[model samples]
Target: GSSGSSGARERAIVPLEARMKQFKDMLLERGVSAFSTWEKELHKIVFDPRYLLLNPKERKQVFDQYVKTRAEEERRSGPSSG
Candidate 1:
């Protein structure tokens, strides 16, 4: 039988998602390039306290995903100048 009841275990993930969106927006505000690797580019955003919210590895992972998504957006829209 499938469980119809949910638990507090589902409650924790919401903050992570919120935090990720906040972090991603921080990147957007800084005008971070969609193609730069976090390793070499980390210095730019690392100065911000928002980058400290997640562990170093986690931050990089999120940044990587953000960049990938951003690239896809640019590709579809053909890099807007307006």
Candidate 2:
């Protein structure tokens, strides 16, 4: 894993509107016009909460929990057995 200055460089924060506009432009260029259904087994994460909206550490932790939950599900299912 990247340490200290390297990790810091990896985690630079982009302003909300700036990042949104950048992705929006890319979507337009790439012809991406829709979001898949997450609760219905479709989409995913990044960013949020009111006072601490910029909390990358918590966001990372939340995503870590998510990966654990997903992995746990497959672990219990045990190699698909098909």
Candidate 3:
């Protein structure tokens, strides 16, 4: 009693290069280093399927945490005046 389509699912697949570019841009915009310290963790978090399922509030919380952490790092490194 199984249809052949049962295992088929639609999902958005972002190319790894594009994801890296986006992460790089985001970090750069926040005056943070794009390839140092947090790259792996950021990529893992951003690309995880669970992240896609987070409710709006949860997603906002995660975003706020990123902003706070990145801002702290930026301040510690001094401002990028460019």
Candidate 4:
């Protein structure tokens, strides 16, 4: 009965490299190098009813916080890291 919802999985332990690729792909999708296109993705997510705690501005702040965190990975200091 392991069969479950597609695309509904969340893991407490996700690979840093995979997370990096998700961020990189989020930017690449709209043919830009950073920020705005990424924000578009965040806006898309923000509307999901499950995230009721986040308002428009709060959702933006969350995405802003992502770079702060992911920069550690970009610096190669992630997952079994320093």
Q: List, in order, the clash count of every candidate structure.
A: 0, 1, 0, 0
Report lDDT per candidate: 0.75, 0.39, 0.51, 0.48
CA lDDT of 63 in candidate 3? 54
lDDT for model 3, on a 0 to 1 scale? 0.51
lDDT per residue as tens, model 1, 1-82:
7376344346555356666777888888888898777755688887888787767787888888888898888558575678
> How big is the positional error of residue 24 in model 4, measured in Å on the Cα after superposition?
17
Error of 3 at 53 (Å): 1.6
What is the per-residue lDDT of model 3 for residues 36-59, given as tens digits with 9 covering 90 to 100? Answer: 444454564565554455454544
lDDT of 2 at 35: 33
Give the per-residue Cα lDDT of candidate 4 at 5: 38
The C-alpha local distance difference test score for the whole of candidate 4 amounts to 0.48
TM-score of each predicted structure versus truth: 0.67, 0.30, 0.32, 0.38
lDDT of 2 by residue, 1-82 (tens): 6354423223577565444445334333433223322222112231222214435354344434544555566658466667
Task: Give candidate 2's error at residue 1 in angstroms.
Answer: 45
10 residues in a row with least lDDT, candidate 2: 40-49
Q: Which scores greater on TM-score, model 3 or model 4?
A: 4
TM-score of 1: 0.67
Cα error of candidate 4 at position 6, Å? 30
